[PDB]
Design a protein around this ligand. Structure first.
Ligand SMILES: Nc1ncnc2c1ncn2[C@@H]1O[C@H](COP(=O)(O)O)[C@@H](O)[C@H]1O
Ligand SMILES: Nc1ncnc2c1ncn2[C@@H]1O[C@H](COP(=O)(O)O)[C@@H](O)[C@H]1O
Ligand SMILES: Nc1ncnc2c1ncn2[C@@H]1O[C@H](COP(=O)(O)O)[C@@H](O)[C@H]1O
Lengths: 252, 256, 256, 199, 186, 244
């Protein structure tokens, strides 16, 4: 049905929960959930949580905390010691689950000490349902059948105009499976990717291959990048890399 | 006087009592449907969106969604634009003969409906004598009510921004006949071939692009600032458009 | 603590009764204009846009449209900045004497207007040394209400989101005097030469660009991330700028 | 000996000078409307007793309509004149291993680095060759060559010029787009385009 | 060798009455030298050296080049700068082999045991980049990663080959095809 | 072909003894190899000039090409910047400099007994009586290349040379410092693979002229060139959109 019907289902779902804990990330999807809950149950029944960690840029954390305070929410940060778990630490292919389990556990621990009834996520329509459906996490946008267009159409109708546009992934995605994640090499990748991002390339991955960095750019951009070759070479060589290379196939 | 142009818009609707509005998804066509719904009621306004071979179904399907979200009884109609030999052979005036067939069907669905006349969303800005669709409209006896109630391009945003209106189609369209030189005959096949070649180009990250049809030669129009960023895709675009039927894939050294 | 920040704004607005607003099109000046319109009424608010030799008319017209569409009684005023020999000779303290001349005219527009105070849209974020207008603004008794209710850039983003404000001017400006070395004096001629070079560069597809004036040499500052996409426009830009008066047109290897 | 400036035709002339003498050996260089005059002039200079003759290739209705056999008919028409210049002068070619007209005229195949082709190779076979469009194609190529692209083809498709460049070079070409666009439009082309494929 | 030095020796040298070919050199080097030698008019005969035989060359120690050179001169024993260009250019000195070859062992890291199979894909990787018009080019061998050193001045000329260069080095065995952001040795 | 040539040997044989002004270019070389082959090693004297206006790199390659060809070569040093016209870069400087150049040559030629001064062209010459035999022998740019490839000439200077005073606008005073700064910025650019390049001097602005076919390839060296030239004294390093 209409966007307005997809919304009555969202507002009806919030009133029954009366009191929620929102896992807020700053993304458009996560933002629309927080503002809607703020508009329904009030600041006293809604607690916004932004999780920082070793695997995610602190720039992202600081922007998500700030964007939440701007919405008028009571925001609380929590930091996950992801590398303490050995699955995440050794970068098994199942690592992205074990971090999500640590994530929804901490959310439910904050949810229990908070008055909140459930934990809300901001995922939408169009890889692990074994993890949300273990901590009783609710994907409210996904339940009212919101796609990315239903989300922009409702956000642009709430006057919401601020969020994080370049989306992130767990920095573990930069290391081949089997390589063990250390603070040293993790800091090294995020340092290089922060630099590439500062040259005007918001989507970039520096893949880690010991002494060789392999830069994944969107093919549309590999042309604009040549002016920065020599600087990126010096800059990434200074971060520990012996050889700085660019993947001819690009990002994705 | 912003509301002195709003009352003039609302007052004309009551005299008509019943209407059938041609909705295209744009901001202009949308403010027409919302005001008619708010003035004449959900039962006295019938929404029509036209699909055709000349427009992507993406644009068609997005307009039908924009109507369901607005809450009107919306209905699609399919025009066989290629039945008229003018459009099929792409005479230079074929833009007119196509718009006439459009308002022809529009007068037919509304006459069967309770509507008195058909309303479109043209504005005083589109008050040019060289704007094509007005001719057929004033022939088919339709009406551009916002243009009559004195709305300009920024004067429409202020009523849109005041009805909380948004969620309208922002990406603008053309009849695909613009890709064919005057005289070339339009078939389903080559129309499909043109629209396929262009979707591929956009999906590489080039939203503004034209694949101009010249029998065996494809002539690509990109915005000149992007031709630098385009080289990395030359060979792939070459082979991909060649598979759609083109023998030569070329890039216009001119712009857009 | 935004719920009580808005009230501080209204209480200051209600106390002034009649105000003259310096509107620039920016988000900051808009929320002040929109708030003062909502509090004192259309007849008790006068919005002023300043045109001058140092800013494009392109900007002036977009601010006049944003004010008229916002629902203000909008009024233009024209400043002869090159009359003050400080602005003219481009000493580093120029943008002060320009700010000083700006607030004087505004206080005169306000003095004849029923307005009690001159409000500008400065905020708490720019409550610092090293920002030009602040000295001149205060020495003139201009009131920055957003600054007084302790609005920061984020508190301003959030109050807009509750007045349905989703339209303001995003392209930020510089005084064109930034394009001339400190010794160079400003002519009506050389400003237009520079302002034209940048508008053409902007037309091609470089909205962020600077043309640095060095008598016969124009130095173009482009964002390095884009200097690759500019190669196709070399010859065009070289020709078009030579006709504006520059003997040599160059591109700065450093960047913006 | 029929001289083209090539190494093959060149070795014959020097040997013919060394074997039969300058007065008993006659050098012939061909002009035409199908080849650049720069090519004609260097062959007469590379020979410098040389004598020029101009062949009316477009008189032949096959060459004029650009059948795939035009290359034959131009070769057939070439040796026809070669047997005629010999009658007043009192014909040798330089083919070297590696025609159905060359042997159809009693020519003997006894055996400049930048090589040339018939400008008919720029026209699709259906396209008919006129003096006008041949002149534009050869001019458009000269302009391209003058920009620093010694290897270039301007393919003629009526309204459309289709430029074939060496792919390695398309990057260095962007700075010249507008100039090439305008310069070939004044030479008659409505649309100037670049083949995304290659040479 | 074909160069200006070895050419002058043939044409200067006694009456009319050897160019090697090895795995570690393109057969192009051996083929153009035998054409450049028969051109000066001499009887030219080839010999081939199984360099992988000696354990130093194949183990890829920095003591390869010495050891590698030593196995060269042995079969030679078996089968039997401004002043030099001034005696060459008086003889109508035609051409010299300017483009210098390199042992392909330089494409592999010090210690990487040399296979025919991975040597092969290096020299294939290099021929392919050369055919597209990059005479100066090295494909450096990091197991699954191909690192391509192009002369920095030619990297803007390279972008049209990226996906094509990519999928083709992949079909030779590389899992990853990269372009060194630093260029050629220089 | 041998006609343009016959005029040359009759002219050289008529002089018997000459003095040849060598620049390293293909033209001056065909003049020098021919005079050696016609008049002998003892009757021809090759002169190369060093100065502030030409890189010493170029000078030394000029002396080498003469020693390899077999001429008795002689260097000489011109104090161009002494002349107030060259130093202040008046528009007539090109002339007063060429006037000074052929002046030292006619005296170095008058001193060694030679009959005329030969240069290799194909109002500065006619005031000194400098004979241009390739132009007198009916040589064009194609006629000069062809005689070299037929005389086995395989080494000459391909990178063309200019007096550095052309990089300075008219009126700018040339200082010893100012010439070296320009000469260095150009050597750096050349070392990146741009043998054809000019760094135009504009006080704080360096304006780089590249052949347009190559400006596409230069973008990777933007930053390197920007800093390297800023360290040589230029406040702003820019690229001329015109090209060379
Ligand atoms: N750093 C984060 N802090 C708090 N909540 C988050 C965070 N990341 C994701 N969430 C939730 O995860 C949803 C999307 O998941 P994902 O795209 O995998 O990060 C968001 O809409 C939020 O509900
Ligand atoms: N595909 C379409 N289907 C139904 N009505 C349309 C369509 N396109 C345009 N209309 C009408 O045409 C007006 C604008 O004309 P145009 O933008 O040229 O197609 C809109 O405001 C609608 O009233
Ligand atoms: N051209 C202008 N015309 C009228 N008012 C202005 C103008 N520029 C600025 N104002 C006001 O002065 C403040 C400071 O402007 P700025 O120095 O550009 O940040 C703005 O936020 C407006 O309130």
């Amino acid at each position: 049905a209409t966007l307005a019907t997809k919304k009555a289902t969202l507002v009806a779902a919030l009133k029954d929960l009366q009191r929620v804990t929102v896992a807020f990330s700053g993304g458009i999807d996560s933002t629309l959930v927080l503002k809607m809950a703020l508009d329904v149950l009030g600041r006293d029944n809604v607690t916004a949580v932004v999780a920082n960690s070793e695997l995610f840029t602190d720039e992202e954390f600081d922007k998500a905390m700030s964007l939440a305070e701007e919405l008028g929410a009571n925001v609380q940060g929590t930091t996950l010691d992801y590398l303490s778990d050995d699955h995440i630490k050794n970068n098994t292919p199942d690592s992205w689950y074990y971090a999500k389990k640590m994530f929804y556990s901490r959310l439910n621990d904050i949810a229990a000490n908070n008055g909140s009834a459930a934990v809300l996520d901001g995922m939408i329509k169009n890889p692990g349902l074994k993890a949300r459906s273990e901590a009783g996490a609710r994907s409210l946008l996904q339940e009212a059948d919101f796609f990315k267009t239903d989300v922009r159409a409702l956000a642009q109708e709430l006057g919401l105009t601020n969020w994080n546009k370049v989306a992130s992934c767990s920095v573990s995605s930069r290391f081949p499976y089997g390589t063990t994640l250390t603070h040293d090499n993790i800091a090294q990748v995020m340092a290089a990717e922060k630099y590439l991002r500062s040259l005007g390339f918001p989507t970039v991955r520096v893949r880690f291959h010991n002494d060789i960095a392999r830069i994944e750019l969107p093919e549309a951009r590999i042309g604009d990048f040549l002016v920065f070759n020599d600087r990126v070479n010096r800059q990434l060589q200074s971060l520990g890399f012996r050889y700085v290379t660019l993947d001819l196939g690009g990002f994705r």
